[model samples]
Target: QTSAVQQKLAALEKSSGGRLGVALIDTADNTQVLYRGDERFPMCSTSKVMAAAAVLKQSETQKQLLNQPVEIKPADLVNYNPIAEKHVNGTMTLAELSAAALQYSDNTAMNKLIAQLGGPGGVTAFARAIGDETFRLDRTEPTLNTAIPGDPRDTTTPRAMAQTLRQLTLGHALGETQRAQLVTWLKGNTTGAASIRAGLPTSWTAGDKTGSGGYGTTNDIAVIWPQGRAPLVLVTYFTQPQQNAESRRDVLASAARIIAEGL
Candidate 1:
């Protein structure tokens, strides 16, 4: 029999009135699927997690502290983030900025993190090192237009992202200490309450990152654990031409509920 989650996801996709892609991996059972998962979509702020990992990786080699303070230049300022706006003309530690980037999805902090890691190419090298071929951090946030006309804004497949998330959790991509920090930021994420978390059972816990862009490009990549149960990783991508945040969130929530209950 088809899984209940699969059946519900198929119905959700058919009724979405937009393009959708989903990937679910039950770590406990080692079962997985990609519903339209091969397709690529703009990663948006979801890419921040990968970028943060890149920096954490560098700290190990450079023998640098995650809390090393960095000066914030006026030129480093980017739009669309209130946290960075408040911190302008001040200094923040690398870890503080990373937390802000992950927790608040602060665009300015993300750009700074990318720059600190040696620009977009740095992020790409880190992704490549981690065996990620589809994710591209070619441009900074608050600037959605791709540098190349035909290229995706900041692209990744659902499978690619899910695998990356799995690696991060398994300590294949980040060391135990760094992994703990990353997990902390993700769990403290204040921006995704309306997305996957909304659909989860109250007894379950989640750590997720959300992404959004023009025309309703809404994405949620999450690690969820049912009460006293094993964890599952979920990646859901949605793009609607008209851009409806609430509707997109509802879709993710519904998917989360189906996945959670099925577990």
Candidate 2:
């Protein structure tokens, strides 16, 4: 099983064209492992996933209304608003914006929601609130990178990300209702960076978030095939000196597929 999987991994890497780090846990047997490359990278957009978790956690803790109206403004954040689309007619509750941020990778929505939740510091505080100290979503200047500063772009280990997901899954990240909402938002997201989505059969019930940016950082974390009795927690962090999005996306997906097949 190991040799065949290794061969598949090698071929997939060559095809996708990026470095990948993967970690998988067999809950039934409690066996776990580390696979390839460094565990950390510049996190980039992936940090938003953690930020989303933070907001949902806060919502549950405060019972802050998810349906509370949030006004979208062009000045809120660059990516959050559109120059061409200037309607601003409706109000999206914090819940909708938060979910939209993860599902669509909408920076405007994410940053805005972060502000609503009490800015970057709030994101961090809530992160710690849920036992995820290593996952930082502080805003960075010149670019507002949104991951951790001085921490290797948004660098994170596969194991760490998996743990984050586990916490969110167990409702440790927030109240049961909030956790459910957060997971539902993640499952609804369509703009994931690659890794996790490439593995699913389209029929599987899986929820995930993707993050990518910087020269060579790509991330994907998910709870996949949840009801199969062999549910898999997949986390892929890939980085290279010269990162290519398309390649890494495909590569990460292949890795997830390989691991899933082994289950």
Candidate 3:
């Protein structure tokens, strides 16, 4: 399965005329492979994971309630519109907002949470708090190559993203309880149906946070089969080519399915 995935990835990189970088770590045993072209790309919505993690961790550390009421006022939505999901309004706890941000990749929800958590600076502070220099929210898009001068918000390496997953899993990054909450939230993420979800079996459970933009790039930083055999951290970032939602999801699903076999 690993070999096949490598082949597909190679083909993808070759065809894209751009790059494909990936990093996979067997969390159970700490085995890993770092690939370039398949390295890290700047994460779009995937940045929400760190942002959400920061907010949750800060709340937990401060002995604040995860379910504590947080008003979803007009100011919170900002440039994004409100979520139209059934009953998405009224008083919402921090957990609900975080879940919305992760599960549905709700931009409005993320923006609101970002503001409540101390805005953009809060997100960065959380990354720094975890000693993650590569994980940043300063870029508007993922980078084509890590070597090019990176935008603070526009970059992350496969290694850095994989490490972040490791931190979330091992309970070392945000404390045990917070880590558990992080994992739970990730499991329910509905954003990137294309990349990480593209490669899973019906019986297997996988969780992830995805980031993609119209003309920018596509990203899926994931926690794969976390509680099952072959648990791993997979981060796939693709740039160039304005793929539609279906196409993007197809790419992700294919890769995810390939990884599922190996797992």
Candidate 4:
């Protein structure tokens, strides 16, 4: 039988008048839901989490890399850089850059960190190493977020993202300490508070990343810990066919509310 959540999601998709991809998992029961979960959507800054994870993955070899300092030039500044903008022409520790990228979605920090890790390919390879071959990163900040309607470059399926997130957030993909650090940074994410995090019950804790892009694109993926219940992984990616329409944070929050209520 079709579950209530699946039915609600289908109706919401039809009324949305746009493309919507959502995937969710109840870690305790493995009860899952999907709507266009296999379809690709622009990843935008959502991949910053993977970049942060890459640093954690590499920390195994050179744990000192986390405390190492990295230079940031004025030319590195990008428009969406909130945290990274503060230290133009200065330096931030590698771990600090990773945290800024993950927590604040700092565009300049992400670009510089990506470059430090040997460019976009390293992120993709890290995703692959964690058993997520379906995820990829083709460009750096600003350029990657263009989110051209039909372009598959720098895109990922909701299924792929949630599974990878599950591994990182709940599985043994990184050392216990590094995994805890990544989760801490993700919980501190400032950009998503108005979206997915707002919809959950106040008692529940959530850590997530948010991304906005061209053509009404707004996406969020989260690891939610419901009070007295097992953890959950939820992903929602939205984009309208119309050109340049801004994605709505309220809608993402509303979607999250509906899902949480159903649970």
Among these predicted structures, which one has the highest TM-score?
A: 4
Better of 3 and 4 by lDDT: 4
Better candidate number, 1 or 2, judged by lDDT: 1
| Model 4: residues with Cα > 4 Å off, grouped in runs | none
Full-model lDDT, candidate 2: 0.65
Q: Can you write out model 1's per-residue Cα lDDT over 135-187, one digit (the tens) per residue?
A: 88777777652222225757888988998898886546887788877888888
Q: Could you tell which candidate, 1 or 2, scores higher by TM-score?
A: 1
Positional deviation of residue 91's Cα in model 2 after best superposition, in angstroms? 3.2
- Name the candidate, 3 or 4, with the larger TM-score value: 4
Best-fitting candidate, scored by lDDT: 4
Q: lDDT of each prediction vs. the true structure?
A: 0.80, 0.65, 0.66, 0.87
Clashing pairs in 2: 41-155, 42-153, 42-154, 43-154, 80-108, 103-189, 216-239
Pick out the ten consecutive residues of candidate 2 with the lowest summed lDDT.
Answer: 79-88
RMSD of candidates 1 onward, in order: 2.5, 3.7, 4.4, 1.3
Residue 89, model 2: lDDT of 50
lDDT of 2 by residue, 171-209 (tens): 355677877777787777686635677676666777777
Residues 24-65 of candidate 4 have per-residue lDDT tens digits of 888989877887889999988898989889988898788798
Q: 59 in model 3: Cα distance from truth in Å?
A: 2.2
Estimate TM-scores for all models. 0.91, 0.81, 0.80, 0.96
- For residue 107, model 4's alpha carbon misses the true position, in angstroms, by 0.5
